[PDB]
Write a protein that binds this ligand. Structure first.
Ligand SMILES: CN1CCN(CCCN2c3ccccc3Sc3ccc(Cl)cc32)CC1
Ligand SMILES: CN1CCN(CCCN2c3ccccc3Sc3ccc(Cl)cc32)CC1
Ligand SMILES: CN1CCN(CCCN2c3ccccc3Sc3ccc(Cl)cc32)CC1
Ligand SMILES: CN1CCN(CCCN2c3ccccc3Sc3ccc(Cl)cc32)CC1
Ligand SMILES: CN1CCN(CCCN2c3ccccc3Sc3ccc(Cl)cc32)CC1
Ligand SMILES: CN1CCN(CCCN2c3ccccc3Sc3ccc(Cl)cc32)CC1
Ligand SMILES: CN1CCN(CCCN2c3ccccc3Sc3ccc(Cl)cc32)CC1
Ligand SMILES: CN1CCN(CCCN2c3ccccc3Sc3ccc(Cl)cc32)CC1
Ligand SMILES: CN1CCN(CCCN2c3ccccc3Sc3ccc(Cl)cc32)CC1
Ligand SMILES: CN1CCN(CCCN2c3ccccc3Sc3ccc(Cl)cc32)CC1
Ligand SMILES: CN1CCN(CCCN2c3ccccc3Sc3ccc(Cl)cc32)CC1
Ligand SMILES: CN1CCN(CCCN2c3ccccc3Sc3ccc(Cl)cc32)CC1
Ligand SMILES: [Ca+2]
Ligand SMILES: [Ca+2]
Ligand SMILES: [Ca+2]
Ligand SMILES: [Ca+2]
Ligand SMILES: [Ca+2]
Ligand SMILES: [Ca+2]
Ligand SMILES: [Ca+2]
Ligand SMILES: [Ca+2]
Ligand SMILES: [Ca+2]
Ligand SMILES: [Ca+2]
Ligand SMILES: [Ca+2]
Ligand SMILES: [Ca+2]
Ligand SMILES: [Ca+2]
Ligand SMILES: [Ca+2]
Ligand SMILES: [Ca+2]
Ligand SMILES: [Ca+2]
Ligand SMILES: [Ca+2]
Ligand SMILES: [Ca+2]
Ligand SMILES: [Ca+2]
Lengths: 88, 86, 90, 90, 90, 86, 89, 93, 93, 86
């Protein structure tokens, strides 16, 4: 099931990076940087632009990205992709 | 990039089934049934289907649009995430 | 070991897989072009698009107006798709 | 699976893999062009003079770099070449 | 091609891959059990687990209290995990 | 990924692939157990011999094989394999 | 492992896959040759006359069939063509 | 799609992978020939063969005697190997 | 994992894939041997042999003359094939 | 494609991958045989036990293992495996 495996990849990827330092279940600036760089290179197409992104994702303003904020982020990307299918 | 491919699969799967009948960009009961059966067998009679169709269709237009589809997938991801909390 | 050279191969070979089916072996007629787009570029068209949208496409690609799509017209068409993809990166 | 749609992906992605290394992130300098040809199009390619002759041909707007549009023309040119094979070399 | 027969093979072979490293060749000491869980069952332990939780586990598996994990104890442990997984289906 | 984690997955999923076909969705009847053994464990495996096995596995004597009895069975096979290494 | 050794294997085996169908097991008749060209070398080649011209060219000992040797020459000849691409004319 | 077309491609490409390393870019010198044989045809050469056996081989393939193996001489060599392989199907009469 | 251990697996498993089809579950009758050779060793038989060449072979493999090929007779056969292969490595003397 | 023919290929090739290392290129000396067994048949091998094995295989007693003696050895392992099916 590509779809079930896709969910697996989404969930597992978060934890591959979140558990590196500090809170094991939350992405700090550094870990977020790794994940985006290694896992979503197409999206990231500089430190200031990173900060603007980190700010956007961290909606509860605790300086880190939890799984929930991570899902919202991925949905956002999905949202973009979907625009292609409706035919701009 | 597994993750970028994962997003691709999520978005593409929706349209593989939504465009079969009626509104090309929305899942009717029949299309949703196919997608769940063929694509999410681990998650899944007719009553339980109706309860699901009802839950996902938050704007109550009798069909599942992409946005409602995303919420549904987030929900599943949410459950998977619980496992990782030890 | 060369995705790009393989990609060119796929681009060139795909044309001839469909063009040589009927009529002129080196040109795509409305029917052959319909097959290629449907089977090979489903993301560009999408299902059951009304014959009118096909005609508008067929018209746009056939720049020398001979009612068929030759390899040169086919490349322009692919370039055009590439161009669109490139906007994503830009 | 769509070999053709993946082929287009490879064509566009390969450009950016090399163009974003130095300088203008959306254009290929002599150096980046040299990597791309060497690693991605070995079949097509070597002294520095032949490279210069090539860089010169590709850079039609004469800004010393190869933009995506110039790149597409280049790839089409290769495809053109390939196409001659299918027509028995007329 | 029998996934299930291969799966049984993997279960039996993985044990011996780690048990035969030191001491009793047919039993897992604290160190050998640490490797197996870290390398082979990362989802169960979650990376970099501290020493106390390890000890609590080593204690739970070693039902005959000989300070090591024999194949039989190992199977119970895997059954346990399988039980866990099974809950998801019901 | 992890051969061993995948191996547990296959063990658990295989059971359900056959248990949910008829009757109790979480138990293997004689018929379902026949399928699983035949298609999935051909090396291990005559109606009488089948009855003798069905009898051995069904330790709580409810005429079917639940997941717990299943794992004991697989453990038994593992046990056999282990003897080779010794 | 060894693409090249595998390539020699494919060359040799493919011949036999078709030669053994009818008549002499170790030679290609017009029909078996037509199959091999159509299914195995579609880029090289359909109308009858051009087939005859080919069968004529390959069958250098003129026994109406294509033996393995006459096959090797044919394949070498194709390789020669391909080589011209590298040998930048 | 076509094992046989791919086979010819590998045949032609492998030549050039080794011939363009040094000297004439379109011919195999003793050294390039030894690489190709060793890395691409290990079954033919077997292993740890003597500089003399190599010389005998280099000598056999270099029909026009210019001390290098060209594409044409290379085709003859592979045909030759092909011939041997063919004997197996012919049951080694 | 280990090509060689997997090879032995394939050798033993294949025998039983065909022997257990009819009659004695642990021996190969004319018919089951015909399937095995055709489906599993096509290179050895070549293509569509006459029934007579099959009989000559069945005869050769069945050393104990019980009209069937047991696992031991099977091994001898496979070793025989290996022997042949080995001649290739030994310069074909 | 043919597992069985590939299996014969592996059997024959493996021998020569080790025999041609030192001395007679077409025979296995004690050292070469040790390598082959260690690296290729780890499941079989439980200095003295090695000597007992070397002695058993070397039926013509020339202090090395030739291909024919190698086939006998492999057949022997096959016999062993066959007992399982029987
Ligand atoms: C076919 N085999 C593949 C694995 N599957 C496991 C089902 C649960 N599993 C999951 C559980 C714990 C952590 C991550 C995941 S990944 C996932 C994603 C979506 C769903 Cl509905 C279920 C899961 C199904 C059984
Ligand atoms: C390596 N090649 C892989 C394909 N890439 C496509 C980029 C756009 N694309 C997307 C667009 C429309 C529908 C589905 C998708 S799929 C996707 C997923 C994630 C992102 Cl950030 C972007 C996309 C470009 C890079
Ligand atoms: C490894 N082997 C792969 C095949 N190669 C073919 C060379 C020419 N070949 C081509 C010719 C005619 C039709 C399609 C193609 S496909 C292609 C794509 C790009 C280029 Cl530069 C050259 C080609 C040569 C190197
Ligand atoms: C099957 N999955 C593969 C990804 N697809 C994404 C659709 C757009 N996408 C594209 C966009 C941006 C950069 C590269 C590409 S690659 C491409 C090639 C051809 C077309 Cl018509 C569309 C695209 C469609 C869905
Ligand atoms: C299909 N190939 C797979 C391997 N088979 C060999 C039979 C024994 N083999 C086993 C023996 C010793 C250690 C681990 C295993 S693994 C296994 C699992 C289940 C069973 Cl019934 C039998 C085995 C049959 C042949
Ligand atoms: C990358 N993905 C691979 C699969 N991972 C398994 C996560 C939970 N999952 C499981 C859950 C429900 C049914 C079957 C299984 S299979 C399994 C085996 C062992 C363990 Cl500790 C956990 C599981 C999660 C990480
Ligand atoms: C890994 N294994 C692959 C197979 N090998 C077989 C050696 C002989 N074998 C051959 C014999 C009869 C028909 C086809 C072929 S295929 C081939 C190609 C090139 C050469 Cl030198 C030798 C052969 C030995 C090495
Ligand atoms: C599917 N795509 C694969 C690549 N194809 C290339 C066709 C020409 N090409 C060739 C040309 C120059 C060097 C090597 C080769 S490889 C080859 C082998 C046999 C033949 Cl008839 C033609 C060729 C076209 C069909
Ligand atoms: C004058 N001219 C016009 C276009 N042609 C020139 C080079 C073709 N040449 C090639 C050479 C040998 C065999 C097959 C090919 S087909 C090919 C494909 C791609 C490239 Cl970059 C170059 C080639 C053929 C004749
Ligand atoms: C270790 N080395 C020693 C030299 N040996 C060459 C003899 C094998 N012989 C053959 C004879 C003459 C020219 C080329 C070949 S290559 C070949 C391919 C297939 C077959 Cl069945 C038999 C052969 C190959 C094995
Ligand atoms: C498709 N291609 C696969 C390779 N084939 C080679 C046939 C001869 N070849 C052999 C000869 C010398 C050394 C190793 C081997 S490997 C082998 C195994 C079984 C048999 Cl009957 C024959 C062989 C021919 C058919
Ligand atoms: C990873 N897993 C691979 C399979 N392993 C099985 C061990 C015994 N197994 C065997 C047993 C019974 C019948 C056929 C076979 S197949 C085989 C071949 C050679 C040897 Cl030494 C051992 C075996 C155990 C290790
Ligand atoms: Ca962390
Ligand atoms: Ca936060
Ligand atoms: Ca619809
Ligand atoms: Ca709705
Ligand atoms: Ca046409
Ligand atoms: Ca036109
Ligand atoms: Ca640049
Ligand atoms: Ca420019
Ligand atoms: Ca231990
Ligand atoms: Ca214990
Ligand atoms: Ca029960
Ligand atoms: Ca014939
Ligand atoms: Ca002839
Ligand atoms: Ca050279
Ligand atoms: Ca020469
Ligand atoms: Ca039988
Ligand atoms: Ca017998
Ligand atoms: Ca030796
Ligand atoms: Ca001896």
């Amino acid at each position: 099931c590509p779809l079930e495996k896709a969910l697996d990849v989404m969930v597992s990827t978060f934890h591959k990076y979140s558990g590196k330092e500090g809170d094991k279940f939350k992405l700090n600036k550094s870990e977020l940087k790794e994940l985006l760089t290694r896992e979503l290179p197409s999206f990231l197409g500089d430190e200031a632009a990173f900060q603007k992104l980190m700010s956007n994702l961290d909606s509860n303003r605790d300086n880190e990205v939890d799984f929930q904020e991570y899902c919202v982020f991925l949905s956002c990307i999905a949202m973009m992709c979907n625009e292609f299918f409706e035919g701009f």
